[PDB]
Design a protein around this ligand. Sequence first.
Ligand SMILES: [Cl-]
Ligand code: NA
Lengths: 77, 86
Amino acid sequence: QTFEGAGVVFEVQVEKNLVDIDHRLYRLPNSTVRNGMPSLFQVKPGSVVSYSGTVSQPWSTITDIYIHKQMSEQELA
Amino acid sequence: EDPQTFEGAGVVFEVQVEKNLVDIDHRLYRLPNSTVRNGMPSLFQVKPGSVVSYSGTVSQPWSTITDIYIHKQMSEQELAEMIEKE
Ligand SMILES: [Cl-]
Ligand code: NA
């Protein structure tokens, strides 16, 4: 039922609530929020992330995601 | 590098909800009610024993955590699945 991982965002599809992390697709609903802002609009290609969620088919749902501030800057460079 | 922002990781040892303070690896940080994740203040989610990644702004007397994530060490890990496949 639950999972946790870490990786690098390669692509974000805001219109489909999907995020591509290390070539794996996850559902990233607007309900995954931090400081009143949906995380779907904060993650970008190159973001280094820690995430957790619930197992679902075909793609698992991320219900919590954190952007590594120093590592995402190093990844983009 | 921004000298006004900070980021770290550690273990929560104590939480003082009445003073908006969190003790991580015996250092103290301000954890205001405005640091919210999924509509809930993170101050009431962190507990002694929580493993955390956090970031914020340098401030006086304590630096302010504006973003904090609890590591789910008890959940099944994608890295474990990766090591099992490799
Ligand atoms: Cl929120
Ligand atoms: Na900084």
